[PDB]
Amino acid sequence: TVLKAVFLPFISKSHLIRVVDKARIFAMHGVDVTIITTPANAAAFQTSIDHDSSRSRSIKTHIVPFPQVPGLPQGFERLDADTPQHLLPKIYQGLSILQEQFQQLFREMRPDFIVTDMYYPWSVDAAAELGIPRLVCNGGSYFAQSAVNSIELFSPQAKVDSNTETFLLPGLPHEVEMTRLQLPDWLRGAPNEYTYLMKMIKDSERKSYGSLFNSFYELEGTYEEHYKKAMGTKSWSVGPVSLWVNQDASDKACRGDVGVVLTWLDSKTEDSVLYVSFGSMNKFPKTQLVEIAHALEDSGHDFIWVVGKIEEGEGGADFLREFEKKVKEKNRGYLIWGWAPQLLILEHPAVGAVVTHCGWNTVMESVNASLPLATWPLFAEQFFNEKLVVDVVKIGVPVGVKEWRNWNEFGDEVVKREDIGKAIAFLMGGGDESLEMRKRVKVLSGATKKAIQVDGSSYTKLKELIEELKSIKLQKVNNKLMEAVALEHH
Ligand SMILES: CC1(C)[C@@H](O[C@@H]2O[C@H](C(=O)O)[C@@H](O)[C@H](O)[C@H]2O)CC[C@]2(C)[C@H]3C(=O)C=C4[C@@H]5C[C@@](C)(C(=O)O)CC[C@]5(C)CC[C@@]4(C)[C@]3(C)CC[C@@H]12
Numbered sequence: 001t002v003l004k005a006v007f008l009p010f011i012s013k014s015h016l017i018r019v020v021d022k023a024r025i026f027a028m029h030g031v032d033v034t035i036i037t038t039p040a041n042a043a044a045f046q047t048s049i050d051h052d053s054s055r056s057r058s059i060k061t062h063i064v065p066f067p068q069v070p071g072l073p074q075g076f077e078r079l080d081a082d083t084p085q086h087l088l089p090k091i092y093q094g095l096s097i098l099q100e101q102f103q104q105l106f107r108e109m110r111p112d113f114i115v116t117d118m119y120y121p122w123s124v125d126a127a128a129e130l131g132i133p134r135l136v137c138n139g140g141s142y143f144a145q146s147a148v149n150s151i152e153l154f155s156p157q158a159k160v161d162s163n164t165e166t167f168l169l170p171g172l173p174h175e176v177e178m179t180r181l182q183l184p185d186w187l188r189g190a191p192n193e194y195t196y197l198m199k200m201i202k203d204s205e206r207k208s209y210g211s212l213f214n215s216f217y218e219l220e221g222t223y224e225e226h227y228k229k230a231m232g233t234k235s236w237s238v239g240p241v242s243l244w245v246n247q248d249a250s251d252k253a254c255r256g257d258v259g260v261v262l263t264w265l266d267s268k269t270e271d272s273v274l275y276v277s278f279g280s281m282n283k284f285p286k287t288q289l290v291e292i293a294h295a296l297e298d299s300g301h302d303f304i305w306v307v308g309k310i311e312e313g314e315g316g317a318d319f320l321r322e323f324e325k326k327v328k329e330k331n332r333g334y335l336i337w338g339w340a341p342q343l344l345i346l347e348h349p350a351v352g353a354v355v356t357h358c359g360w361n362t363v364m365e366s367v368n369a370s371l372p373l374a375t376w377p378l379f380a381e382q383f384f385n386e387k388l389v390v391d392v393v394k395i396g397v398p399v400g401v402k403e404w405r406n407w408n409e410f411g412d413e414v415v416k417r418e419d420i421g422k423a424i425a426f427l428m429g430g431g432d433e434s435l436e437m438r439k440r441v442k443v444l445s446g447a448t449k450k451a452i453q454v455d456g457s458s459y460t461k462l463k464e465l466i467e468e469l470k471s472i473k474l475q476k477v478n479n480k481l482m483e484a485v486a487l488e489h490h
């Protein structure tokens, strides 16, 4: 009959809200969904779950207490930027302890299939023990995963010396040039511990039923097909997930949480405000914040700056509080010190462009809101996402960042105010080339909205997947009938 699914999200904020939204999409289309999580993580999205159950979807959370770990204080259950760095491996250790409780819950709930974050590679074995399909949720774009596979297969970085020599990523449908410094540490040379984790994750994916991406075909459908052939797997684009289940203002306001900025926006003319955000994980050093502050002030344009994680005192916070005073004196700038209501802001007509670290969720949300991008990749797969934005679909301009760094370090590179200002001036300056870029993102904005409406590309992929899973459930029911009839004869 009715499919039953258990969803297992990860415990970093961006991954959590992406996989929770995928859970909400499945429940919107008839699946009886249970989301397993811990209290501090549930706090970020239980409100969204309550709104959904009122549209009488069958979706609920199942709260599991976070384990005791020596030296880990109570209440620390998330991997985000506000988390003190020495607690991260302990938090990850506590998550690992939960695996057996998760598996017991699978055996107790007996779902027809499970949908789990990529950071749970063992879940493919759990599903095989239960005899059910496991879907894996992958972060980021098909493009970025195609680029990673090109690096792994062809090693173009091995044939160059220096750090400024560009190389093509072979086999991709588009010509894409990068330097060795723009590759992740775990891909560049000898394996590190993350290289081995990624190997285990990709092996798990190859054994899984299929993968789910927050993507849509009009944006990067060529890479969706490329990726399926690179992996030899099934995959479905089911995005933009943020738009699909957060079309209401109340949902946009509460997403991932736990009005003054909206009144400020209401006072501005259309497309006049630059939105600046570097995602849920980034922490900039003071010297970088100084360059951004000067670039924003010197641009002459209105802006909202989501400052992200700031070191206290002379590590940045003192400077930003002084800068915030300055820019309120002119009514040109607005700083957001905590979690911003990103979906509500991007949809506001006053917003005209976005400075982004190329986190895939912000790229997708900006496309839906029809906003051109200034690209400032930092870590993870963001340098690959920049290539797609800048070189393939041409909806952004780069600030000019040269070097990948890990998420927990400041690196050696400081992007200077002049280079930031060049990107702002292009986006906000009204020149003809920027206007052609705005038209390109507008076309894609219309495509996003169509993709999740009835018989859009993402709607259809989800419908086809659910039909396959219904088919598998029914096959097992009819096989039991066949076995019982055979035992009757004898
Ligand atoms: C933010 C995302 C989710 C990710 O972001 C995702 O990055 C993917 C990528 O890396 O390609 C993209 O595919 C995807 O789209 C994007 O969402 C970027 C990488 C990372 C920041 C990641 C990390 O750095 C290192 C560790 C260590 C691993 C390990 C083995 C150790 O080494 O000690 C054990 C201890 C330890 C602290 C566990 C925690 C992780 C897994 C940690 C902090 C979790 C958050 C994670």
Ligand SMILES: O=c1ccn([C@@H]2O[C@H](COP(=O)(O)OP(=O)(O)O)[C@@H](O)[C@H]2O)c(=O)[nH]1
Binding pocket: 014, 015, 017, 242, 255, 256, 277, 278, 279, 280, 281, 282, 306, 338, 339, 340, 341, 342, 343, 358, 359, 360, 361, 362, 363, 365
């Ligand atoms: O102040 C903030 C920062 C981030 N986000 C949301 O958090 C996600 C950030 O994910 P992204 O892929 O852009 O970057 P990451 O956080 O993974 O580095 C997006 O859904 C944003 O809408 C938000 O609502 N408010």
